[PDB]
Amino acid sequence: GAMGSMERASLIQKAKLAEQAERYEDMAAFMKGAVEKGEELSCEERNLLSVAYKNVVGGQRAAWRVLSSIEQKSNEEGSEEKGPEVREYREKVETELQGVCDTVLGLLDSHLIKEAGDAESRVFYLKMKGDYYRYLAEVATGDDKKRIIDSARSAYQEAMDISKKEMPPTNPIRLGLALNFSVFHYEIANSPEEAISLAKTTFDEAMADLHTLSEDSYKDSTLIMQLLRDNLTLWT
C-alpha cells in the first residue's frame, strides 16, 4: 500500500484532480489506494476507478498496436533484419500492459466483486473483469490464450445474465456491457455473427424502452445506442 497512509477521502479528491489534469496513471494509483481501504465503492467512485484504468490501458493498447504493426512489417518477405529491438520493446510494453490488467483484475477479485450485491455495482465490476481479460486476450499467444478468452466470456456472461434480470434495457451499464461483449465476439472470439446479433438486439430493445426515460436519461442511453449503431455500420 503505497497510498496506505493517505485518507480515503483525500485519495478520491486527488483522483478527481488527476482527472482534470489528464494524469491518468496518478488517477489510477489514487483509486487503487481507495479500493485498498476495503470499503465498497459508490457509483461515482466506481466510475473514477474505471475511467482511470481505461485511459491507462488504452494508451498502452495504442502503443502496443503501433509496435506490433512495426514488428510484423520487419518480419515480411523482403525486410532488412533490424535485430531484436522491435520485439524487445513490444514485449516491454506488453508486459507493462499485462501488469496493469492483472492489477485491475486483482482489485476486482480482492474484494470488489464478492462484496457487490446490487445489480449496478456487480454488473459494473463484471463488465470491467470481461474488459481487462479482453485486453489480456488481445496480446495473448501462449498455452493460456483460450483460457484468457474464456475468462473474459464468463465474466461478460454473468454480467449479461444479471443485467437482463435486474436492469431495464436502456440502463447505460447494461448498454455498455452489451457494446463491449459484442466487440469481444467480433474481435476476440471470431464470432462476428454473434457480435452483430447482440448489438442489434440490444439496440432494438433499448429503442422500445426510451419512452420511459427523462430527458437526461434519454441522452445517456441514446449516446451508447449510437455506438452500437456505429459498430453495426462498421460490420455490415
Binding site: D131, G176, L179, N180, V183, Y186, E187, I224, L227, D230, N231, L234, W235
Partner: peptide, 5 residues
C-alpha cells in the same frame, strides 16, 4: 477499431 465504453 470498434467502439467500446
Amino acid at each position: 477499431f470498434p467502439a467500446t465504453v
